[PDB]
Design a protein around this ligand. Structure first.
Ligand code: HEC
Ligand code: HEC
Lengths: 180, 229
């Protein structure tokens, strides 16, 4: 095979010299970043399985319930700023679901890289349990699907427990435009 | 017919214009297709240059010329490679012009040495490489067909074929939403920026590694440069 060497590290190490304070870490892959890259996001069955084992343990669930605030969850969904070097200090991060998902059926700007989430809660009978599944999906998706293209929001420090509570509510709160 | 024809004619100036301690122009700068010869040189870039011993894009090449031929102080340019309101980029204008000397030509990079095949590989790797707080890779958003981010459709770049050809045929380009002509460098910067990565080094190895991959997946693409977007 065209065995691609560890010459990829240097090329990054040496080509990424302007670093905001404490960003050397953003270059080093974690073990589930590394497998997904070396196999072009096509894990083998065994590959996928090990990831899941390491990812689903990293999931912390809230002390209280899953549901939060759908009105404030809508704000997490639309915000596409956060985490960037171009981003001024204090910039509140979002999940930006709209970039990849259809959410509010009424809304006309949405991506198709991810699944339609229109009526998600209603389609799942508003089940409190299936919302736990949607929580752990936002907190860490690679816990349920290895090498998935959805960001591991909650395990990577982009989303706070409360933001996930809020964005899940947007999928699950019967009174949300997503569920209407 | 296109506001990006300023940069075209601003790049024509700087190519003609003697500069540096040696105070000569870049009219004798070799871009791969022989000294001075501008025809098709971008359609065959990035490539290996014997005078350095590496693979090189258009900008890394221009900059080399500025150093040795002209003797121009490049340090202010690697610092402000991307133009602003009320301030040009002599690195985006010389790309417009040189790119236009490859207009109507077909994209045709070739893996011909140990250096270029190695580079392409590493660019393929960097294309797939997941890293940082959003876990993104270029292949996350360029890893299939018929996909769109919000309303903007995504070009497939993980395979040879249409999208890629058309893409590298539409770069460098003019974006009205900024009202500025932009080069592959800036796009590379913008995408790593929005991947939550650190800001890549202008004219670095990684950027040029990616470009070769993108350009090799773009083989056959008939340059129509610089475009309107
Ligand atoms: C960078 C792309 C991306 C972004 C951003 C993103 N998603 Fe996803 N999402 C995907 C993809 C691709 C899948 C399918 C693979 C999977 O199961 O992980 C998915 C799956 C899901 C699913 C399960 C889909 C199903 O089949 O039932 C849910 C629910 C979901 N995402 C919610 C969210 C929420 C909430 C956000 C905002 C916090 C978000 N997504 C942001 C790409 C994305
Ligand atoms: C945020 C998701 C996202 C990621 C991550 C991403 N892309 Fe893009 N890409 C897009 C979108 C959306 C556009 C359309 C913007 C435009 O071209 O004006 C685009 C456009 C492009 C274009 C120009 C397309 C054209 O014809 O105008 C190139 C080249 C490109 N991407 C390559 C890359 C590379 C290389 C990377 C890795 C540094 C990358 N992309 C990462 C979503 C993404």
């Amino acid at each position: 095979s065209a065995v691609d060497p560890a010459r990829v590290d240097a090329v990054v190490k040496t080509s990424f010299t302007k670093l905001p304070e404490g960003w050397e870490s953003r270059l080093q892959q974690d073990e589930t970043q590394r497998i997904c890259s070396v196999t072009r996001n096509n894990p083998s069955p065994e590959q996928a399985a090990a990831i899941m084992k390491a990812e689903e343990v990293r999931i912390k669930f809230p002390a209280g319930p899953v549901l939060g605030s759908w009105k404030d969850g809508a704000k997490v969904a639309q915000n596409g700023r956060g985490g960037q070097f171009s981003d001024p200090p204090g910039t509140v991060s979002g999940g930006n679901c709209y970039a990849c998902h259809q959410l509010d059926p009424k809304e006309v700007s949405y991506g198709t890289l991810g699944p339609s989430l229109v009526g998600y809660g209603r389609e799942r009978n508003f089940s409190a349990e299936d919302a736990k599944i949607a929580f752990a999906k936002v907190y860490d998706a690679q816990a349920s699907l290895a090498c998935s293209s959805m960001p591991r929001f909650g395990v990577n420090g982009v989303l706070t427990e409360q933001q996930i509570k809020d964005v899940v509510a947007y999928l699950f709160d019967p009174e949300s435009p997503v569920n209407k | 017919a296109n506001p990006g024809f300023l940069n075209v004619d601003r790049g024509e100036v700087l190519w003609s214009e003697p500069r540096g301690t040696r105070n000569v122009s870049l009219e004798t700068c070799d871009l791969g297709e022989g000294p001075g010869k501008l025809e098709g040189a971008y359609a065959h870039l990035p490539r290996y240059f014997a005078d350095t011993g590496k693979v090189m894009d258009l900008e890394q090449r221009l900059l080399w010329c500025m150093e040795t031929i002209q003797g121009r102080d490049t340090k202010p340019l690697v610092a402000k490679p991307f133009s602003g309101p009320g301030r040009t980029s002599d690195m985006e204008d010389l790309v417009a012009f040189i790119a236009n000397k490859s207009d109507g030509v077909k994209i045709k990079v070739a893996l011909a040495t140990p250096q270029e095949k190695e580079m392409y590989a590493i660019g393929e790797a960097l294309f797939f490489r997941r890293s940082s707080i959003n876990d993104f890779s270029c292949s996350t958003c360029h890893g299939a067909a018929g996909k769109r981010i919000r309303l903007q459709a995504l070009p497939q770049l993980d395979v040879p074929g249409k999208d890629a050809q058309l893409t590298m045929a539409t770069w460098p380009t003019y974006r009205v939403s900024q009202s500025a002509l932009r080069t592959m460098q800036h796009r590379m910067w913008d995408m790593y920026r929005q991947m939550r990565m650190p800001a890549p080094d202008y004219a670095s190895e990684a950027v040029t590694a990616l470009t070769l991959y993108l350009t090799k997946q773009a083989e056959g693409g008939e340059l129509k440069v610089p475009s309107i977007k």
